[PDB]
């Protein structure tokens, strides 16, 4: 997270950490708890090649990584069939937990938007995670969860910005309709935030607008971050998460 501060301890109860086996269970990717048995994340964190489920665990909302680990096993991985790379699209995946989570004040689900919500500019949105804090350098060894508030851009204005300083012809769509753009040169997601939730407060209710997907480096000029647009995939999500 570039910009912003340590998150308050109550504020984002749905945030998830994905851990890979090694010399220790290391954080590699974000996610969000959307149902007591289901985590929503990005597809490029887990695919397109198939992963052994022995090597993966889920950690629920810590304040600090590694300090108080309780590692949940994963029963199933479901990657959207259209995915192969994040710039093509469909960068969305589901994890089914082996055991259901006991919902609590400290652990609660986020709400998914109704398909009609478009999230125009001016929507108050935040992104959270344990990624890198500047373009080249790691989150320091206390490892606090960080938050930042980010401005939304319209897709056409965002696609135009990606053509500045590029050879790509203006007729070629870089930013697709399954995508969303947010952030600026001071305020962005970075490496290790991928798969984490973008949430906007609408009529008092927190809704997940997006999943951190890809970009041309952290906080670079004219290169806003690209998010997977959650409304585009609601029908695919509801084939598995029982609503």
């Amino acid at each position, epitope marked *: 997270i570039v910009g912003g501060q340590e998150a308050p301890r109550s504020k984002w109860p749905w945030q998830v950490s994905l851990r890979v086996h090694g010399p220790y*269970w290391m954080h590699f990717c974000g996610g969000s708890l959307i149902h007591p048995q289901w985590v929503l994340t990005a597809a490029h964190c887990v695919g397109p090649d198939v992963k052994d*489920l*022995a090597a993966l*665990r889920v950690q629920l909302r810590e304040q600090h990584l590694y300090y108080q680990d*309780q*590692l949940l096993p994963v029963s199933r991985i479901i990657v959207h069939p259209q995915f192969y790379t994040a710039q093509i699209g469909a960068d969305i995946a589901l994890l089914e937990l082996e*055991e259901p989570v006991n919902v609590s004040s400290h652990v609660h689900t986020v709400t998914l938007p109704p398909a009609s919500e478009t999230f125009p500019p001016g929507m108050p949105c935040w992104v959270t995670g344990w990624g890198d804090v500047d373009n080249d350098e790691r989150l320091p060894p206390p490892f606090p969860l960080k938050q930042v508030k980010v401005p939304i851009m319209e897709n056409h204005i965002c696609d135009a910005k990606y053509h500045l300083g590029a050879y790509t012809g203006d007729d070629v769509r870089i930013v697709r309709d399954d995508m969303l753009c947010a952030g600026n040169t001071r305020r962005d997601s970075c490496q290790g935030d991928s798969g984490g939730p973008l949430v906007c407060k609408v009529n008092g209710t927190w809704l997940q607008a997006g999943v951190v997907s890809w970009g041309e480096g952290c906080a670079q000029p004219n290169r806003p971050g690209i998010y997977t647009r959650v409304t585009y995939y609601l029908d695919w999500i509801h084939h598995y998460v029982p609503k």
Partner: antibody
Amino acid sequence: VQLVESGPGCVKPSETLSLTCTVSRFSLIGYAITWIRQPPGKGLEWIGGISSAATTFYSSWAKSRVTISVDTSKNQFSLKLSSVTAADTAVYYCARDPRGYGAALDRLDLWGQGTCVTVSS
Amino acid sequence: QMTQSPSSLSASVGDRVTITCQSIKSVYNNRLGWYQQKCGKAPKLLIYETSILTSGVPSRFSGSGSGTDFTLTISSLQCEDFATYYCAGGFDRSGDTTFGQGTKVEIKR
């Protein structure tokens, strides 16, 4: 990386059997342990296990009498079986599931060598 | 719950054999494995997830099964293959999981 059981070998009726499984180097932080029993001349029967989340699961018969627990300060897993009958005479094993599932038998990748326990007067 | 068949077999060195295991429910999501047990030893995992061969196992062994019926096959029995073999399966999460009865294999010489 290997598992070692420990236990009394010989026990008197109505005692409570205590077993411990110890992990020798590194730690099972993200791992499950299950307990397996083999009475003389039978096949394998499952007692129970503990998941990576510290959830516990017990068989159809074991819920009456068995408790399983973990102590990270010792790198130890423990089994207790109350009110033992002679029919509790068996070899007992601890085994690891590498996926961390607390109620699974299809992928027990690492086993101890086992402790035999005889119950007699 | 499961029934494993046959209870015993005996065959030549070099011979081609298979073991079958069947159940009244299908396994939850390929959760079936095969274990080998030898003269006073802990079981060793040979096959997991219906068909994945455990590393270090010689490619004599393979298995697969139609979701409710499962086979383990040995292409050419060695005397080193003298053992009991068990299927194990899992039918949900938390609930029904069990071993089979186990098959005893003697090698004729």
